[PDB]
Amino acid sequence: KFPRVKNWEVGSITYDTLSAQAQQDGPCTPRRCLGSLVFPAPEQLLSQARDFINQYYSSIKRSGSQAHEQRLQEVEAEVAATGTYQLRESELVFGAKQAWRNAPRCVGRIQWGKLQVFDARDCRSAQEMFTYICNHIKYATNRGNLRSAITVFPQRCPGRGDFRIWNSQLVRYAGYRQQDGSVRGDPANVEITELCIQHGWTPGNGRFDVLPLLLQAPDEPPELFLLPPELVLEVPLEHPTLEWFAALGLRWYALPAVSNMLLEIGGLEFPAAPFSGWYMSTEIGTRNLCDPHRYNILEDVAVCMDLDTRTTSSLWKDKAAVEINVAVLHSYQLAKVTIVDHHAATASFMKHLENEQKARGGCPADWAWIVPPISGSLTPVFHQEMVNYFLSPAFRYQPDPW
Amino acid sequence: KFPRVKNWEVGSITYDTLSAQAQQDGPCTPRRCLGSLVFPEQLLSQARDFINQYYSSIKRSGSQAHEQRLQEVEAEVAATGTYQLRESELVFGAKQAWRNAPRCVGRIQWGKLQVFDARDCRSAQEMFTYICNHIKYATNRGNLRSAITVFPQRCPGRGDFRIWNSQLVRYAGYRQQDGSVRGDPANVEITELCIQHGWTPGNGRFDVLPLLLQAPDEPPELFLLPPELVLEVPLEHPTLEWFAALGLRWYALPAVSNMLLEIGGLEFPAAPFSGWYMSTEIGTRNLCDPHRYNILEDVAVCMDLDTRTTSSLWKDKAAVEINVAVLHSYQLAKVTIVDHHAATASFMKHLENEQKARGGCPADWAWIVPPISGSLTPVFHQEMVNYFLSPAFRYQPDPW
Ligand code: HEM
Ligand code: HEM
Ligand SMILES: Cc1cc(N)nc(COc2cc(CCN3CC(F)C3)cc(F)c2F)c1
Ligand SMILES: Cc1cc(N)nc(COc2cc(CCN3CC(F)C3)cc(F)c2F)c1
Numbered sequence A: 001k002f003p004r005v006k007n008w009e010v011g012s013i014t015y016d017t018l019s020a021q022a023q024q025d026g027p028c029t030p031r032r033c034l035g036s037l038v039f040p041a042p043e044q045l046l047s048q049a050r051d052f053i054n055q056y057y058s059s060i061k062r063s064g065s066q067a068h069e070q071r072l073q074e075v076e077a078e079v080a081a082t083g084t085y086q087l088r089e090s091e092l093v094f095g096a097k098q099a100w101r102n103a104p105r106c107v108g109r110i111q112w113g114k115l116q117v118f119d120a121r122d123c124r125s126a127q128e129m130f131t132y133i134c135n136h137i138k139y140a141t142n143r144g145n146l147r148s149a150i151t152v153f154p155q156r157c158p159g160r161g162d163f164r165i166w167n168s169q170l171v172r173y174a175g176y177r178q179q180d181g182s183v184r185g186d187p188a189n190v191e192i193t194e195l196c197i198q199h200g201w202t203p204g205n206g207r208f209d210v211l212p213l214l215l216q217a218p219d220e221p222p223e224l225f226l227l228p229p230e231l232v233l234e235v236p237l238e239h240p241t242l243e244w245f246a247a248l249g250l251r252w253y254a255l256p257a258v259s260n261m262l263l264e265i266g267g268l269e270f271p272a273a274p275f276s277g278w279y280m281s282t283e284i285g286t287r288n289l290c291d292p293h294r295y296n297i298l299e300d301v302a303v304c305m306d307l308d309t310r311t312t313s314s315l316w317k318d319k320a321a322v323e324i325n326v327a328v329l330h331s332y333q334l335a336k337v338t339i340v341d342h343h344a345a346t347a348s349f350m351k352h353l354e355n356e357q358k359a360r361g362g363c364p365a366d367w368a369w370i371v372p373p374i375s376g377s378l379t380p381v382f383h384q385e386m387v388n389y390f391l392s393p394a395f396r397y398q399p400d401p402w
Numbered sequence B: 001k002f003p004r005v006k007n008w009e010v011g012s013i014t015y016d017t018l019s020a021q022a023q024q025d026g027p028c029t030p031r032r033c034l035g036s037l038v039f040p041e042q043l044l045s046q047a048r049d050f051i052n053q054y055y056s057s058i059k060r061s062g063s064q065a066h067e068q069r070l071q072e073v074e075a076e077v078a079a080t081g082t083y084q085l086r087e088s089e090l091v092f093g094a095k096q097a098w099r100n101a102p103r104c105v106g107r108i109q110w111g112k113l114q115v116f117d118a119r120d121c122r123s124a125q126e127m128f129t130y131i132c133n134h135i136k137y138a139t140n141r142g143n144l145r146s147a148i149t150v151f152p153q154r155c156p157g158r159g160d161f162r163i164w165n166s167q168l169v170r171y172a173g174y175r176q177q178d179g180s181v182r183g184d185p186a187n188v189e190i191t192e193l194c195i196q197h198g199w200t201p202g203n204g205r206f207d208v209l210p211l212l213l214q215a216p217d218e219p220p221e222l223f224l225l226p227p228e229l230v231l232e233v234p235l236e237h238p239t240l241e242w243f244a245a246l247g248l249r250w251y252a253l254p255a256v257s258n259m260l261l262e263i264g265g266l267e268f269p270a271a272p273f274s275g276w277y278m279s280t281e282i283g284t285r286n287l288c289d290p291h292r293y294n295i296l297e298d299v300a301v302c303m304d305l306d307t308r309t310t311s312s313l314w315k316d317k318a319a320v321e322i323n324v325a326v327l328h329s330y331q332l333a334k335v336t337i338v339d340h341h342a343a344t345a346s347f348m349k350h351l352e353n354e355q356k357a358r359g360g361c362p363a364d365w366a367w368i369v370p371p372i373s374g375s376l377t378p379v380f381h382q383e384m385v386n387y388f389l390s391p392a393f394r395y396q397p398d399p400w
């Protein structure tokens, strides 16, 4: 039998048949589980390519057609003579959508079919590259009505270096390593901040300075491009009832755009392929503003709320953190920037799981990452047993280029 | 072979060298991770291994008292088919089985645990007497103390001592003719058993169930608990005066009565254990889970929150005040209670000690991180390795 999974809220029990098709292997063994750890050539090429082509031809219900036979023989031959192959434009669209769908740690996959694929595979420099990214940012932001998107730059090929985006996200706030060891700004970004300065960017001093982009064309040092201020939509944070909250001077950007993962499709690998959607409020509120190693505003909010911060059995931390999440959602709703709260996010996810069971008989999900970072057992995915495993196509972490 | 484990808030790295000695096999493979799932003569070799453990524990291994005990158990099994634990070994295996429990966040307490030897027990009324001493001793007027009572081990050819109740204190769950349930829905199966085995049903949301105790090769027997023995806490809020009127209450003693204990290849199908509650077990899981008392929307109504839009975070605002009411009510009543913040920071200190005592600590992240305010507690940011050491507590098939 396959793994029996159970919902503890309804009582229902499914079986994950899909997990059996897992090709690449993960970090657990029968002797110890490592599911909480953040970071765990022609014939392999041909078998990876073959499986993808079959997936494409399954999707459009043309399995076994003449075109399916022919595209396999086609791909077999280009690999035999070039050692590589090229994806058709429609295969590349299907692949990116499958990579999102396959991402165990994404709670937003109900959207996986509504994804706008920008082909940039004939990009030829860091300048053309920056251009493709401003077009992405412009399209996905859409003056606050967010639309998911991905720009696919050229594939890894033997002989040439990769395109790389050095920033982890397109929009990120500077993190200034202050002289006494602290940080003014986002501490997650002190490394990329240091690298930007060294490469010629003149920094500022705010807690919310937008970083410039370091873009790396093949075999070439990274280049510095500044984003146009009017392309970076930002939301000033205020509270529906706590009027002093606005004086804190808090801002966050509209667009979450992950720029440093690698997209892998039918064995081909795309080092640079920024994708974006919209935020879940708890990523801004709890994670980005309350993590102790992030902006870490939680105690200061609480004191202004006049909460007894001297004993945890008042649950001041939880009262303050709830209020920072109210402010985030209310400020996005105000500025008319798309955003979703962790209750709708996770209940749409439960709608994704049920479809995936019908569609594929399984859905790779990382429980520790799908459960939101506040109010876990309040949401429905808490009581949902989940099976984690690796499908291709896929987004993958990759080394920092430097 | 030595799993690197990181703390992301701090940036500290340690390696778990203890996972190499993992006795049994978990549910996971290189192909698929199943951590999230809730339920995932060679006797001589388990018993040999536990004894080296024990004598190493007390700084006198391979020595004189070691080899005596070895050829002791050997002859015991060769003459019987099982063997008998020394009292001190029983005490030590009791604490180890708690200390090895990967899902327990309270393991900072594993040193202080009162073991009650009841392996000289026969008859359900004898069971019932051992049990009420436990309850009395562990309640201790509200200053809770940790304890386990060990009933006679499994042995070949013979029946078994089973407590049919999942916990020693459990509220009744009456399936209604409208479909739903009055009381604790978790307990619909045990409550029907109590009626089927003689008990006269109450009809309240907090009717304490009787005890169905089973002695080898006889049916189980009803055993009602003296009401002065089951310390309960009426729930009220420090500032919301209506809250008291909701009539909520919970019990003082978390006491688990359905797990099996395993020591040196020996298995004890009855061995109940008890400590004190973490607040989020009461406030968030038992009162707020959709399939338990499910009180969130009622508390929210009373606070005049907006319940037709998820983004007002009414579920969160309600849950917090419910948890605040739990903490206030236990403190007011001088019953031991611990909040998830204090608990989780103590569990860090347990991880950090155990890193020096044994070089690691089996921990199940999904069950260590509390069900409210996850990322606000420091265990959220701690990578964890889950494996199975022995001795241990285990789940076991229901007796019927
Ligand atoms: C449209 C709305 C979307 C929402 C609400 C959403 C939500 C989320 C959240 C909350 C996470 C966990 C993030 C963290 O805490 O680090 C995540 C992870 C992830 N998302 Fe989504 N996402 C969306 C769109 C997308 C798109 C469009 C893609 C790719 C085309 C994508 C791919 C991924 C991947 C690969 C991860 C895993 C990264 C990691 O392990 O940190 N997501 N998503
Ligand atoms: C004294 C303070 C204690 C605290 C604060 C505490 C807290 C907790 C919590 C919150 C859990 C997770 C709830 C769950 O399992 O769903 C748990 C599980 C557990 N604890 Fe503790 N506990 C304490 C004492 C004990 C004692 C005295 C023992 C045994 C002698 C023990 C052994 C276990 C076991 C075996 C489990 C879960 C088994 C499983 O689900 O696989 N704990 N505890
Ligand atoms: C498209 C999209 C929409 C949305 N709402 N959120 C995301 C965040 O995804 C990622 C988020 C992070 C940040 C790392 N994490 C640890 C910290 F706590 C956040 C890395 C990464 F590699 C991701 F992919 C993406
Ligand atoms: C001694 C002690 C103290 C304390 N504070 N909590 C406990 C929890 O005991 C257990 C509780 C449960 C219940 C299952 N889960 C669903 C609900 F969410 C808890 C299972 C289990 F296997 C346990 F072991 C024990």
Ligand SMILES: C[C@H](O)[C@H](O)[C@H]1CNc2nc(N)[nH]c(=O)c2N1
Pocket (backbone or CB within 6 Å): A036, A037, A038, A368, A369, A370, A371, B008, B380, B381, B382, B383, B384
């Ligand atoms: C150590 C731990 O696994 C790590 O902090 C994880 C836990 N789960 C998470 N889940 C999400 N969605 N995002 C995260 O950053 C994390 N962090």
Ligand SMILES: C[C@H](O)[C@H](O)[C@H]1CNc2nc(N)[nH]c(=O)c2N1
Pocket (backbone or CB within 6 Å): A008, A382, A383, A384, A385, A386, B035, B036, B037, B038, B366, B367, B368
């Ligand atoms: C499906 C999932 O494994 C299940 O809800 C788990 C999650 N974490 C938990 N954590 C604790 N402490 N108790 C639980 O019952 C659970 N349940």
Ligand SMILES: [Ca+2]
Pocket (backbone or CB within 6 Å): A086
């Ligand atoms: Ca061609």
Ligand SMILES: [Cl-]
Pocket (backbone or CB within 6 Å): A256, A283, A288
């Ligand atoms: Cl982010």
Ligand SMILES: [Cl-]
Pocket (backbone or CB within 6 Å): B254, B281, B286
């Ligand atoms: Cl409980």
Ligand SMILES: [Gd]
Pocket (backbone or CB within 6 Å): A241, A242, A243
């Ligand atoms: Gd106000």
Ligand SMILES: [Gd]
Pocket (backbone or CB within 6 Å): none
């Ligand atoms: Gd009122």
Ligand SMILES: [Zn+2]
Pocket (backbone or CB within 6 Å): A028, A032, A033, A034, A035, B028, B032, B033, B034, B035
């Ligand atoms: Zn695992």
